[PDB]
Amino acid sequence: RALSCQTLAAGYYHVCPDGLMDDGRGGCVVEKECPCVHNNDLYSSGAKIKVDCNTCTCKRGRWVCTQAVCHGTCSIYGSGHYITFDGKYYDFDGHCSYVAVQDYCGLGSFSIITENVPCGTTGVTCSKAIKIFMGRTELKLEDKHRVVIQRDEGHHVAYTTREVGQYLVVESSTGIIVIWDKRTTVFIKLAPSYKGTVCGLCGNFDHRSNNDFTTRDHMVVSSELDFGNSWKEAPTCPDVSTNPEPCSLNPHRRSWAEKQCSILKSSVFSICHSKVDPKPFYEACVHDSCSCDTGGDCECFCSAVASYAQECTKEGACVFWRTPDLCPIFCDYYNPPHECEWHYEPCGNRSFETCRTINGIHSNISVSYLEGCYPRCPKDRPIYEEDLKKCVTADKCGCYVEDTHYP
């Protein structure tokens, strides 16, 4: 009988005396003061960690966590890669308009459409436009900007568009949040009131992932290509009959792709290796770089390495991976000529005063993990007015009525 504070719930089937047991840290410890392990770190008793909306506590070698329900996230990224709200990864290379999320599922209040076009010559497709339908308002995310289409007469569901780092962030008062890096990566977030009431290529958000491949006619199939071909918008769009292999159709681009994308499995990201699994991000980066064969492949690369480093910040590991030779960023472009306020914050974590939040206006999620260039406004005008990218005095910023900046 030699217990170990890690084999408590194993069963002791097949040093410390009777009573005391090992802790994995050092000497023999009683059962009450036993520590806890989480992602290869060792936390003593009464320690506090957060898990995405909740707070936990190492009590007696076990974790005691609060039970609140967090927001759910769908991902669309690169050359046709998906993660559903329930966490199912798949690949679909379709060339039409597809339902991403909607609640017109068998009456409804929103719809989000993705427009996937061929990017390359191998037959893989990537997402190049997002259409957001909220009631009768139609936004559209296209050509690095948001466009308002068909604003209704007096309803006007309250939405907000602002720019956080390198991404554009649309939020709605009804609980719908769309985050877009202005090229191919989209993040949709829904408030936890939408549990089990959505469908599309992002699943149905009911914390059970063996029914995310439900087709439009309410049938759970096992194929990625019978599911994804049923959410196309036009009936005359073709069916995808196989998934392409880009590094087999381009044998000459494989050696560059597997050497550039090996940063993720290297010692640069070694703080995140125990917190986020790098293996589906390595395979996405190689799939993306073998297939950008018509032009601009160092943009297909730097997006795939920033999809992994974003998860690392979100889990508690800030990694600084960019150099002047590998994916450089140009943040002193935005400075007033040589007064240096715009700095590259590699993991976003800074909470400064805008001219929204000085008047109480706050968001419903935490977007303080988004990479980009952030201001550090001086002490004669310390209030950042967002719609012009200028630091202003707290009096002279603007108006913000009907989602339009008025000076």
Partner: protein
């Protein structure tokens, strides 16, 4: 205890197979296959050649009521790396160090390498033979409408480049695509003719190599009970066996049905009790 040479032993003592009890039963139909059935709802299949493998089957009544390295079986696969003390881990080797059955075992860590780059001589042998899972001229294209071999191909290259006996890892990974294809109806009759046929022709004189060997194709001693040990619910396996008739005798070759045996000790086909020894059944 199921050692990797046969050698099933109960409470540190050798047992003879079959061994049927009240709560479980252990069978051995094909000398490289052991089938264990339990009354609780647990079924085991232990593979012994080329490499040792294990297959476990639970009913859906035990759904959300198991813990181990096999997860908790609740429909979601995001919480399979949830440890027995709270929270979900990130990597497989961090989850699985919480299920050590011995306290004095060291902790293991992941490995972000592929074996087909560390070995240049094994990576051409792995490419030529594991590509047969993907090309349609072979008897593996019949399963491409059901099984989608793109993830078996990635593991076939993994195990072939990694282990020291590369053919035993090839033939184990090709016999796992064929195993998981017979689970969806499509049975591959005769996939061992060019690739892993180093044991096909080595069957004895009367019995041949089969692809659908099951428990209830046994001797006429199994016909004496005929409702006690059949154990439906398993999968068919491939080994040496007898054809559509001529059931197995007590030892050696399999004689036809008329002079099989009369099983007590299995008597020959010349004994009269008043029950004359006959084809399978007895006139009692």
């Amino acid at each position: 205890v199921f050692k990797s040479d046969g050698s099933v032993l109960l409470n540190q003592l050798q047992v003879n197979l079959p061994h049927v009890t009240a709560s479980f039963s252990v069978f051995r139909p094909s000398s490289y296959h052991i089938m264990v059935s339990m009354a609780i709802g647990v079924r085991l299949q232990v593979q012994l050649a080329p490499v040792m493998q294990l297959f476990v089957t639970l009913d859906q009544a035990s759904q959300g009521q198991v813990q181990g390295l096999c997860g908790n079986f609740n429909g979601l696969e995001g919480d399979d790396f949830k440890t027995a003390s709270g929270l979900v881990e990130a990597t497989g080797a961090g989850f699985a160090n919480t299920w050590k059955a011995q306290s004095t075992c060291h902790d293991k860590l992941d490995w972000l390498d592929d074996p087909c780059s560390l070995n240049i001589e094994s990576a051409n042998y792995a490419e030529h033979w594991c590509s047969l899972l993907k090309k349609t001229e072979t008897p593996f294209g019949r399963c491409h409408s059901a099984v989608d071999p793109a993830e078996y191909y990635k593991r076939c290259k993994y195990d072939t480049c990694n282990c020291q006996n590369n053919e035993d890892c090839l033939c184990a990974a090709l016999s796992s695509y064929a195993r998981a294809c017979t689970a969806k109806g499509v049975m591959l009759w005769g996939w061992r003719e060019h690739v892993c046929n180093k044991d096909v022709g080595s069957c004895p004189n009367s019995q041949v190599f089969l692809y659908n060997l099951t428990t209830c194709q046994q001797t006429c001693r199994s016909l004496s009970e005929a409702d006690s040990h059949c154990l439906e619910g398993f999968a068919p396996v491939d080994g040496c066996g007898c054809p559509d008739h001529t059931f197995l005798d007590e030892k050696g070759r399999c004689v036809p049905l008329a002079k099989c045996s009369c099983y007590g000790l299995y008597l020959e086909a010349g004994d009269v009790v008043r029950c004359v020894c006959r084809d399978g059944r007895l006139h009692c």
